Design a protein around this ligand. Structure first.
Ligand code: HEM
Ligand SMILES: *[C@@H]1O[C@H](CO)[C@@H](O[C@@H]2O[C@H](CO)[C@@H](O)[C@H](O)[C@H]2NC(C)=O)[C@H](O)[C@H]1NC(C)=O
Length: 186
């Protein structure tokens, strides 16, 4: 599948991403301006817009279960619980030990039918294994989905069972940058 540009109609934030038609989950990403000199920023802003039937959602930042930064989130009442994770060998991802700070942004909204997780991911383009994403080129993202609740929803590091579905999408990171990024942070 292929990402495209869309505007969130309530916040006005502009993202690049997809809606999975099976679970009707929207995934969106937006990056700060490309640097004219020096290194690129290592942060981005994302969102997951998920029906309440979605018990946990994962984003795989290099498109794979293994050897890449994973973001996991679920709703627990009127709060989003989230974490950064990492796996090798196809087992339960555990807490990531690198430098990546996930912050839930105030646009985050939980209503009677959906949870809309809007987040800032600092240090999320470069990982402590030396890998990461190249924000000037084309890559693959993946998502993972479960309709079964995690073992303990109040614990950000809760265990849980394997996803019931996963999927992939191509993204042109070069076109996912926004002049309005700094405004999204305010
Ligand atoms: C206990 C929890 C989990 C278990 C046991 C598990 C296990 C697995 C297994 C066995 C596969 C291969 C499935 C196949 O090809 O038939 C896989 C694939 C995948 N998993 Fe997980 N997973 C778990 C959680 C997660 C999480 C939290 C994420 C992302 C946030 C994730 C992302 C992926 C992705 C993107 C694939 C497909 C690409 C690949 O083969 O690497 N998984 N997982
Ligand atoms: C709960 O939140 C979702 C996501 O914002 C709302 O669904 C969206 O509603 C806007 C209109 O404001 C539409 O333009 C989008 O197409 C909708 N998105 C999705 C994923 O359906 C939803 O209406 C809210 N529900 C309630 C009861 O307020």
């Amino acid at each position: 599948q292929s990402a495209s540009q869309f505007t969130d109609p309530t916040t006005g934030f502009q993202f690049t991403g997809i809606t999975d038609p099976v679970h009707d989950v929207t995934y969106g990403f937006v990056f700060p301006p490309l640097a004219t000199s020096g290194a690129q920023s290592t942060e981005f802003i994302g969102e997951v817009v998920a029906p309440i039937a979605s018990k946990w959602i994962g984003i795989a930042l290099g498109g794979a279960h293994n050897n890449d930064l994973l973001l996991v989130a679920w709703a627990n009442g009127n709060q989003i619980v989230s974490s950064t994770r990492w796996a090798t060998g196809y087992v339960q991802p555990t807490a990531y030990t690198g430098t990546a700070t996930l912050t839930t942004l105030p646009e985050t909204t939980i209503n009677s039918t959906h949870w809309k997780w809007v987040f800032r991911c600092q240090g999320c383009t470069e990982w402590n294994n030396g890998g990461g994403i190249d924000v000037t080129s084309q890559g693959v993202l993946a998502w993972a989905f479960s309709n079964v609740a995690v073992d303990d929803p109040s614990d950000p590091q809760s265990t849980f069972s394997e996803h019931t579905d996963f999927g992939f999408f191509g993204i042109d990171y070069s076109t996912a940058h926004s002049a309005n990024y700094q405004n999204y942070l305010n």
